[PDB]
Amino acid sequence: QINRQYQLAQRPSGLPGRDTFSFVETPLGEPAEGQILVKNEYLSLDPAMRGWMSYIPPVGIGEVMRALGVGKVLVSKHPGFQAGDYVNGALGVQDYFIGEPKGFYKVDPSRAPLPRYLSALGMTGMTAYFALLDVGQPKNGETVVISGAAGAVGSVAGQIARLKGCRVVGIAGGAEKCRFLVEELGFDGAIDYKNEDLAAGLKRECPKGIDVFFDNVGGEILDTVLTRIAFKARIVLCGAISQYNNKEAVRGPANYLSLLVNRARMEGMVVMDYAQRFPEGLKEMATWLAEGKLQSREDIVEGLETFPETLLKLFSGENFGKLVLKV
Amino acid sequence: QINRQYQLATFSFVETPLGEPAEGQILVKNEYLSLDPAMRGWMNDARSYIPPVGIGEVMRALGVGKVLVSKHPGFQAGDYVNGALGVQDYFIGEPKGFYKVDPSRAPLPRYLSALGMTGMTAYFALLDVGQPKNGETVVISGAAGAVGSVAGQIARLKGCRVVGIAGGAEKCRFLVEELGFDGAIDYKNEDLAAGLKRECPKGIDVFFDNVGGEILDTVLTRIAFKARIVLCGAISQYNNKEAVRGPANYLSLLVNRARMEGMVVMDYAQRFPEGLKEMATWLAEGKLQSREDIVEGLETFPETLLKLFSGENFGKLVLKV
Numbered sequence: 248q249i250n251r252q253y254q255l256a257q258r259p260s261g262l263p264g265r266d267t268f269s270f271v272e273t274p275l276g277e278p279a280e281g282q283i284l285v286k287n288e289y290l291s292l293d294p295a296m297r298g299w300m301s302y303i304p305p306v307g308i309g310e311v312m313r314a315l316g317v318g319k320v321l322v323s324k325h326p327g328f329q330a331g332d333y334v335n336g337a338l339g340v341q342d343y344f345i346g347e348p349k350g351f352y353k354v355d356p357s358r359a360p361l362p363r364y365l366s367a368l369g370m371t372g373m374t375a376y377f378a379l380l381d382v383g384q385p386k387n388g389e390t391v392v393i394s395g396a397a398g399a400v401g402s403v404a405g406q407i408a409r410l411k412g413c414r415v416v417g418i419a420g421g422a423e424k425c426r427f428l429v430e431e432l433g434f435d436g437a438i439d440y441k442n443e444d445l446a447a448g449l450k451r452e453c454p455k456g457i458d459v460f461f462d463n464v465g466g467e468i469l470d471t472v473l474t475r476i477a478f479k480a481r482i483v484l485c486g487a488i489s490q491y492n493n494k495e496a497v498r499g500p501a502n503y504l505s506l507l508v509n510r511a512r513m514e515g516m517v518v519m520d521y522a523q524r525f526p527e528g529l530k531e532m533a534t535w536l537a538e539g540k541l542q543s544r545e546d547i548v549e550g551l552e553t554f555p556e557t558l559l560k561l562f563s564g565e566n567f568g569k570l571v572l573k574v
Numbered sequence: 575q576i577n578r579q580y581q582l583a584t585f586s587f588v589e590t591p592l593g594e595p596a597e598g599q600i601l602v603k604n605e606y607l608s609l610d611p612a613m614r615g616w617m618n619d620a621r622s623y624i625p626p627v628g629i630g631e632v633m634r635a636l637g638v639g640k641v642l643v644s645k646h647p648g649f650q651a652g653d654y655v656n657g658a659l660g661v662q663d664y665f666i667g668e669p670k671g672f673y674k675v676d677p678s679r680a681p682l683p684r685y686l687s688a689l690g691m692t693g694m695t696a697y698f699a700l701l702d703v704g705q706p707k708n709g710e711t712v713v714i715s716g717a718a719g720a721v722g723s724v725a726g727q728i729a730r731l732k733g734c735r736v737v738g739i740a741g742g743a744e745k746c747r748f749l750v751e752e753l754g755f756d757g758a759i760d761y762k763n764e765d766l767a768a769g770l771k772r773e774c775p776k777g778i779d780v781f782f783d784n785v786g787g788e789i790l791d792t793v794l795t796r797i798a799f800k801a802r803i804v805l806c807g808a809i810s811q812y813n814n815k816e817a818v819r820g821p822a823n824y825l826s827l828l829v830n831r832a833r834m835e836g837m838v839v840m841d842y843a844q845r846f847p848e849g850l851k852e853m854a855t856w857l858a859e860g861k862l863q864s865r866e867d868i869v870e871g872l873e874t875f876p877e878t879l880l881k882l883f884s885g886e887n888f889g890k891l892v893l894k895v
């Protein structure tokens with residue numbers, strides 16, 4: 248049995264294209280004590296990958312590329328897991344995972360499709376959940392603005408905010424995504440940053456200011472949102488995708504003093520800090536899904552070999568929904 | 575009787591007749607006036623936290639003074655007050671945001687510094703927003719200034735390691751030898767990153783920012799897990815003809831799961847009594863020190879005013895009227 252794997256060959260400069268990865272065929276090993284062996288089925292493609300090439304150590308050169316995934320346990324030398332289980336874990340960009348199941352959890356394939364355990368019922372879902380609710384602390388009637396709003400995190404964030412009684416405004420790229428936000432996910436409004444002036448969009452959509460800004464994007468979008476925040480607003484720093492491929496320095500928010508004028512808070516978060524609360528998060532999210540109160544879209548791309556090419560879709564805005572790679 | 579005033583024209587010294595207080599009003603002989611950096615920010619156009627001084631109107635100044643006549647249920651003749659008394663001999667109007675100060679518990683001018691606005695800013699911004707704990711490392715910008723020098727001393731009292739950033743070898747010496755800061759970084763002569771690397775081994779848990787600009791952006795690179803950055807001001811940016819700099823390292827808040835939060839001292843006006851009571855005991859026991867640089871004569875105003883961005887004020891700048 249062969250285990251195909253993408254390895255990190257070189258730390259990339261800007262956008263990471265080919266020759267950044269090395270496609271390698273190594274023989275399938277066997278798990279040691281405390282380890283499990285997993286047949287990888289669906290891989291999560293995440294903007295955080297660029298950073299992996301910080302809050303977590305980077306990928307070692309010559310190591311398998313880091314990747315969250317869902318897979319079938321073939322064998323287990325670990326009390327927590329048994330052969331036949333389906334697991335969410337750091338499975339890597341390869342056919343098969345062998346190692347310590349640290350922070351792995353079982354998923355039930357009969358209750359939801361596997362790729363869902365990478366979105367709304369996975370990491371991106373939890374990010375939206377804990378970031379919005381614990382850090383954003385939205386309340387009934389508050390104006391909630393979300394960047395990267397048609398994405399996996401933003402789309403779930405927008406909807407939970409809607410369920411909390413918030414007026415929800417999405418900032419997204421292109422007419423199709425902005426239409427999706429309003430007609431499908433139930434956002435109160437949308438701003439197409441690619442086609443309309445963002446400031447005028449915000450003035451239109453948030454005339455009395457913004458109480459909660461969920462930032463997935465950073466850059467000029469963040470800086471413009473800053474001129475419009477309300478007294479005691481919360482800015483959740485979830486990501487800065489517009490900056491991840493910078494050869495140049497990060498674009499700092501020149502309107503940051505709005506946080507002073509408005510006595511507002513800007514706070515960062517990392518989803519793994521909430522691991523102890525995952526079951527309660529996953530449980531409540533699941534009931535939202537079942538009740539039709541929240542919708543999750545996955546964008547599945549087939550074939551492990553397409554990894555380098557498919558990854559770039561996140562940075563070109565080419566993904567429509569949570570990007571998943573079928574192995 | 576005459577009320578000498580400075581009203582916003584660069585200014586204008588105009589003698590005016592002393593009027594008389596109506597209902598809801600008090601009459602106050604102004605004794606000491608607060609010269610604050612915020613005086614500049616008040617003169618701008620864009621929506622600040624409080625509306626600008628109107629063209630032609632008496633220049634805003636916080637001050638301490640004696641009530642001569644009260645037509646207000648909360649104030650009595652002979653009370654001493656703190657309030658927006660303005661750049662003038664006498665205040666007449668509603669005591670919007672005034673409070674009584676006990677002249678027995680402290681020197682009158684101290685009710686403009688540690689027991690006044692700058693002291694309460696340090697008090698509430700550090701403790702409510704920074705929430706420093708025993709053994710945490712607390713870095714203060716403008717640490718020699720009126721807010722920073724108090725914030726750093728309260729930090730010391732809470733059991734923190736306290737590191738100050740200040741201009742000049744003299745001021746840095748003062749923080750360590752006189753105020754009891756654990757370390758000091760001379761931003762004017764020394765590299766800041768190296769200074770911070772040196773003075774803050776375990777990273778930075780609380781940053782009390784009075785300055786913004788490059789200092790903030792450098793501090794961001796060494797904040798710790800779950801750090802708190804208190805935005806109190808951005809003095810290095812107030813005299814900019816062009817755009818505020820902006821922290822390029824702000825994503826440190828993400829990597830470190832840290833919080834950056836602004837505050838305005840008057841939001842805590844209702845809690846001033848407990849804050850002032852505690853601050854008074856610290857001063858009285860000699861645990862916390864307050865410096866005021868007092869210049870005599872209202873007439874010296876425009877000259878005295880030219881000090882707060884220079885760095886010439888040693889202590890809280892106060893004008894005796």
Ligand SMILES: NC(=O)c1ccc[n+]([C@@H]2O[C@H](COP(=O)([O-])OP(=O)(O)OC[C@H]3O[C@@H](n4cnc5c(N)ncnc54)[C@H](OP(=O)(O)O)[C@@H]3O)[C@@H](O)[C@H]2O)c1
Pocket residue numbers: 293294295370371374395396397398399400401418419420421424463464484485486487488489490516517518519560561562563564565566567568569570
């Ligand atoms: N802090 C944590 O714990 C944590 C965990 C997971 C993810 N994240 C972060 O959350 C954010 C969203 O991730 P996701 O999984 O939901 O990915 P996603 O939003 O589903 O996909 C990426 C989206 O980013 C937008 N985008 C890319 N470049 C942009 C640019 N230059 N300007 C504006 N928009 C741009 C594109 O949307 P448009 O086509 O609409 O422009 C693209 O569809 C990322 O910043 C990620 O790093 C944080």
Ligand SMILES: NC(=O)c1ccc[n+]([C@@H]2O[C@H](COP(=O)([O-])OP(=O)(O)OC[C@H]3O[C@@H](n4cnc5c(N)ncnc54)[C@H](OP(=O)(O)O)[C@@H]3O)[C@@H](O)[C@H]2O)c1
Pocket residue numbers: 610611612691692695716717718719720721722739740741742745761784785789805806807808809810837838839840882883884885886887889890891
């Ligand atoms: N948010 C609120 O409620 C509130 C209340 C009061 C004050 N503030 C703000 O907090 C700040 C402190 O006010 P303060 O009364 O304590 O004034 P201050 O510190 O007594 O006077 C100015 C001090 O700022 C420092 N400074 C000036 N320009 C600088 C620069 N370019 N780089 C580095 N340091 C510089 C100087 O320190 P060195 O001489 O050592 O360089 C100087 O001592 C101001 O920005 C003020 O507007 C906010």
